[PDB]
Design a protein around this ligand. Structure first.
Ligand SMILES: [Cl-]
Ligand SMILES: [Cl-]
Ligand SMILES: [Zn+2]
Ligand SMILES: [Zn+2]
Ligand SMILES: [Zn+2]
Ligand SMILES: [Zn+2]
Length: 92
């Protein structure tokens, strides 16, 4: 919870970080839908969908971690302590 006292130069540095981180769900939700609404459950078809979802997850996590890392490294040492304490309290 950005209680980090962000500097105005930090506020805009972050805004520029998000537009870049330092980039096939609909394709994914669609395939999920077709698995759920089928008369039967086909395990091998589901496993192929789960594998396809790992691709997208990989891209999304990489982008999310690199972004959060870029933000961490614009912080002052006191602000990094608060970032780190906040991290302990969030789940995502
Ligand atoms: Cl859908
Ligand atoms: Cl942690
Ligand atoms: Zn649908
Ligand atoms: Zn039927
Ligand atoms: Zn931790
Ligand atoms: Zn996160």
């Amino acid at each position: 919870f950005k209680d980090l006292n962000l500097t105005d130069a930090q506020k805009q540095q972050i805004r520029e970080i998000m537009k870049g981180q330092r980039m096939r769900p609909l394709e994914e939700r669609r395939a999920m839908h077709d698995i759920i609404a089928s008369d039967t459950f086909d395990k091998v078809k589901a496993e192929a969908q789960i594998a396809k979802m790992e691709e997208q997850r990989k891209a999304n996590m990489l982008a999310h971690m690199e972004t959060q890392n870029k933000i961490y490294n614009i912080l002052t040492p006191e602000q990094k302590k608060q970032f780190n304490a906040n991290f302990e309290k969030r789940l995502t």
